[PDB]
Amino acid sequence: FVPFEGIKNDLKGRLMCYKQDWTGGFKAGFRILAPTTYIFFASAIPVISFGEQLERSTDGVLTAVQTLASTAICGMIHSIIGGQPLLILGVAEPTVIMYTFMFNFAKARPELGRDLFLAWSGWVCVWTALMLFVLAICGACSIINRFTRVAGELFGLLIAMLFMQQAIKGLVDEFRIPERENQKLKEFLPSWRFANGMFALVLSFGLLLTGLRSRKARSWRYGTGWLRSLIADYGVPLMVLVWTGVSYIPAGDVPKGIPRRLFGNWTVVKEMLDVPIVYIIGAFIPASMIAVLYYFDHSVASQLAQQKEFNLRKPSSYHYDLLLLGFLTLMCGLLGVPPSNGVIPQSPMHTKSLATLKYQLLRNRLVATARRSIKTNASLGQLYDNMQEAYHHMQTPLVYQQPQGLKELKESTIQATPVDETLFDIEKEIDDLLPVEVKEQRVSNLLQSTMVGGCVAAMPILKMIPTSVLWGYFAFMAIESLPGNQFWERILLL
Amino acid sequence: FVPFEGIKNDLKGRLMCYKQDWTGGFKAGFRILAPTTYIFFASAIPVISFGEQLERSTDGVLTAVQTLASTAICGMIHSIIGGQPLLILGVAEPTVIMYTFMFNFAKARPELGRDLFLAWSGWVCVWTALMLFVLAICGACSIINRFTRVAGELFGLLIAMLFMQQAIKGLVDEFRIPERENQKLKEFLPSWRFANGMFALVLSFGLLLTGLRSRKARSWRYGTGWLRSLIADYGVPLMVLVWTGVSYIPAGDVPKGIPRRLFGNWTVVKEMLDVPIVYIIGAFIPASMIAVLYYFDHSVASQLAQQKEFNLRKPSSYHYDLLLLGFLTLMCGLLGVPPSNGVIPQSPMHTKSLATLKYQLLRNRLVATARRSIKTNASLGQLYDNMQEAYHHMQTPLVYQQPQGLKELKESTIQATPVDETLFDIEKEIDDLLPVEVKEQRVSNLLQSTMVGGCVAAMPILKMIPTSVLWGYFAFMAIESLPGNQFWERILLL
């Protein structure tokens, strides 16, 4: 717990893999788009829903534009000067709840009111940034190492429950009347309300089930490997588009608002000084709560994305990441947008997507080299050396760790068996000698954040997405937040 | 093709396993209820739907009561004096189509009209019975042996397509207005029609998916074996009841007819003679068509239930079955109910259910005897002999064939391994040395037919079932009609 020690160590560790990170990201060509698109959707949809929630709860002060902008800019800044690019930054539900409480508080104060809510929020963000700077400098993140696996598994289960609760609330609300829209409308009649609710159920459950099924496309006996990979990679986005189109089928015999549809930044410094100095000091309380919440969430999200099973070859940057989070919180507060922070399951999903990308690249290369070696000599022991050489050749030269390497050939495999092609199927065997590795780089995070920012200008296209699709995705991510963790497995076995 | 040869041979073969059939059925206690209940539902639901269709298409002359009664009585008669009890008898879609055509024809004839439609149908049935008697006596069923596997696979695919088409038509009609009900009603408004359609979609798809998932309960890692078996056995009926109850949840905020709900015999001999003799002769044409259709359907259904992969130990009764079908057609025509005939996939489903029952009984006995032997000596070769002895002891003593017997212990199994319990798991190994056998008896068919007959008196309970559940079951049976047949597999691989 020495001042500036952890930050300096993290910077030293991460400064010798920066060019390597960018060059590795550029090494893979357009194949990096699949994880990028997957995480882009996973980050945009919850953020858009949170923006709509804030707009309904803040009388239009904060909308999806502000949340999307915060997520975007903070994501780009982290991707460029972050330290742990595997982390995905975005506006989380606890931030929305806290901002709702602050807005409700300020609305009842004649001193603050509604026109000064953003300024008071900015002062709260300044206090939170100071607290985060103090925590990072003093090495308070060292306690994160103390927290064991269950400390993160419980948080993941809690986030899954929160996402499922949000989805269920949305589905139920599809049956009810909004508190802002015109009450005397054709689309809001009890019969049409029931129809909207059941249609929302159909769309949401269809999206959820089809996406879950498509996630297992690679393990299908039918179609070609190209199509199977395309489905396994872009199924959930494709399902989103497909069910959005399905929602338009009965448009010729139904009122306008059936099913219900969805729908830069500025500075608040000038009006920040107009706040009387009895609430600038009072911001220490909500700032304290938000600082504690962010200290916990950022670190837990970063560590859940750096699981030992992934065999990462680069160090961690907890302290420097917290310092940059303080800086980003200050910037967001000054810009009049809610702060962003490390979110789950977005970060572990990003890590798993990168691991799958590297796995597929390695599988393709090894299958190619095995096929090339089968024709020439194919000695079953000289071919294996060729695949090992190719594996080492693909690898990025670093200084911290070394490649895991192809694992030992199983005794049963050699016993079953130059090499006879009839008795040696490459596709069946390669999967048995492929380690778990992650393609670590900064390109995927940068593109994902830029795409989220681009959604600000694509609002007309986003107007065509029904809310039922959002609730189906929320449940999909909730199930993704318990993808087989040890705690969930033990509860299941109990 | 000698007169009365095939009938006599079939009777000779089947007359020496009658008491054995009944005693084998009574050997299994209440465990025979699961296949009985499964096939009872599979036979009752399509028959009820066909009855509603006929009622709508025959101006109330024929309802679900007549179809249920025909199915019941014919099923009991076949189960007692049939010859091939694996066959399931019921009113099929081709019979409904033919009867619809005959009713439409008669409605336009002033000589016949509507009050004499049943009498003309009875004369048609008399002609069909005579044709079936002639076909059976002359040994025309010998050509059935000529027809190969594809001849039955194509028929199964056609029946699957017909069932799926019926389900899709029902789902679409849930969105439209019936042509008999009052047009000026609250439940038939366009908004309420749309709500009913989407609710029907939800219920049907929920039933279909939940039943398909529950069909694989035995291969689950969770719960106890008792619960897993109960689910795998009674899932589809339980799902029917569960979704029927779910349909009642919104009853407190929806009109009466949302979702749409579903709702002995006599003699027509006296009015049969009132038909002028220009149509009694004219019945030869529809009688000829129905006779050809029945000759094909009965034989194909019987042979699809006697696949070689099932290793049946009893002979076939094609000719005698056709003769009894002629008798039953005559009886049904005289009773004023549509004739019954062998139906698919009900018969193959019955055979598979009986095979699963025997498999589970054998697995339980072998697991018990292996556990008992493990404590005493457990020599891995003396225990196997004990399991073989138990298998032979359970077996029914017949004269035609012999038990297949436990297959050879795999070389890998013995190589992997008194016997160490840690390295020899019974549950994992038993499945590897269990042959495919069918529990052939007449009790299951008799109980299923009696239950179908009992549904006549349980009409009030059947009034609570929505039509969407029927369409979900129709799709479930359609998928059951292509359960992995070779033709469907080849088309899939193409």
Author numbering:
A (entry chain A), B (entry chain B): 5 to 267, 278 to 431, 440 to 516
Please, what does the article write about this entry?
Boron, essential for plant growth, necessitates precise regulation due to its potential toxicity. This regulation is achieved by borate transporters (BORs), which are homologous to the SLC4 family. The Arabidopsis thaliana Bor1 (AtBor1) transporter from clade I undergoes slow regulation through degradation and translational suppression, but its potential for fast regulation via direct activity modulation was unclear. Our findings show that AtBor1 is regulated by two distinct mechanisms: an autoinhibitory domain at the carboxyl terminus obstructs the substrate pathway via conserved salt bridges, and phosphorylation of Thr410 allows interaction with a positively charged pocket at the cytosolic face, essential for borate transport.
The protein yields of these mutant AtBor1s were more than 10 times lower than wild type, but we obtained a stable protein sample from an AtBor1 active mutant (R637E/E641R/R643E) using LMNG detergent. We defined this mutant as AtBor1active and identified three distinct active conformations from 3D reconstructions following cryo-EM. The second class revealed a unique structure that to our knowledge has not been previously reported. The densities for TM13 and TM14 are disordered, so the atomic model was built to residue 516 from a dimer structure at 2.77 Å resolution and a protomer structure at 2.55 Å resolution with robust side chain densities (right). The putative substrate binding site cannot be accessed from either the cytosolic or the extracellular sites, defining this class as an occluded conformation. However, a structure in an occluded conformation has not previously been reported for this family. Interestingly, residues 369–373 and 457–460, which form short β-sheets (β1 and β2) between TM10 and TM11 in our IF and IAI structures, switch their fold to an α-helix and loop, respectively, in the occluded conformation. In addition, TM10 extends to residue 390, compared to residue 368 in the IAI structures.
